[PDB]
Structure formats: structure tokens, C-alpha cells
């Protein structure tokens, strides 16, 4: 009822030029959240056991 649906149309945008800046931090911080997940994994398993 809001609108006749033709809303989403294909479009093109270029990929941002890569560098050392963001991937290394992205992956080390992913390491951080997965070390977190390991910690809560161990804690939950200990509580369950």
C-alpha cells in the first residue's frame, strides 16, 4: 500500500583501495572476538559439566 514496488535497482561503485591500515586491525580484532568466544566457550562448558 505504501508505494508501487520498483525500489531496488542495480548500481555500481568501485572497491576502495586497500592498504595495511584496516585489514591487519580487522583480523587481529577478529582474533580478539574469537578469543572471547573461546573464553565463553570454556566457561559455558565448565558450567555445563
Amino acid at each position: 500500500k505504501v508505494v508501487k514496488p520498483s525500489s531496488l535497482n542495480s548500481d555500481k561503485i568501485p572497491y576502495v583501495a586497500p592498504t595495511k591500515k584496516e585489514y591487519i586491525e580487522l583480523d587481529i580484532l577478529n582474533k580478539g572476538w574469537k578469543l572471547q568466544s573461546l573464553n565463553e566457550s570454556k566457561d559455558l562448558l565448565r558450567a555445563s559439566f
Partner: protein
């Protein structure tokens, strides 16, 4: 009481679930130790090998013994009945009571 064979069968089964409980407990300690191993202290590193080896050897032989029990089930096949004599034994005891009634020197 039950014949002995059933007695050692139930003892072996009880040993089986106690071994399973020990396996679960050792899983708990190995999960515990891996956390600090990931933390970064290498002192408890030697204990890790021992814990893993004991965990695996506890997991294996328990299942092996249970397999032996299930195998025993295979050859144990072929290897109110009491009522057939029940009245008789009742009969016996009743007459015994009469004897106690019949002799006044034993009613003390």
C-alpha cells in the same frame, strides 16, 4: 538373593557408568586447562599431554568393556515357578507352628 553371575554383571555395568563419569570429569579439566594454555602461561603445558592421553584411554576401554558386555548378551541366551512349591512351603511352616503349639515347654 540373585545368583552371583548377575552380581558381577551389575558390578561391571556400575564400573562402566563410573568410568563414563570420570571421562566427563576429565573432559571438564581438559577444557579448563586449554583456557589458560590459550591465555599464555606455558607452565601447565606438560600436564596437557597427560590429560589428553588419559582422556582418550578412558574413552576407549570403557566402550570396549561395554562391547564385551553386549557380546556376553549374545551367548548368554539359552543359559510362577515358585508357586509350584509355594503352597508346600506354606504347609511346612504351618505344621512347624503346630509343633510350637503342641509342646508347652518351647513357648518361652
Amino acid at each position: 538373593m540373585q545368583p552371583p553371575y548377575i552380581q558381577e554383571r551389575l558390578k561391571s555395568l556400575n564400573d562402566i557408568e563410573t568410568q563414563l563419569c570420570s571421562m566427563l570429569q576429565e573432559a571438564s579439566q581438559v577444557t579448563f586447562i586449554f583456557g589458560e594454555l590459550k591465555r599464555g602461561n606455558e607452565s601447565v603445558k606438560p600436564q596437557f599431554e597427560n590429560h589428553v592421553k588419559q582422556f582418550y584411554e578412558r574413552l576407549d576401554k570403557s566402550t570396549t568393556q561395554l562391547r564385551k558386555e553386549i557380546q556376553l548378551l549374545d551367548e548368554n541366551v539359552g543359559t510362577n515357578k515358585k508357586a509350584l512349591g509355594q503352597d508346600t512351603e506354606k504347609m511346612e511352616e504351618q505344621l512347624d507352628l503346630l509343633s510350637a503349639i503342641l509342646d508347652p515347654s518351647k513357648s518361652k
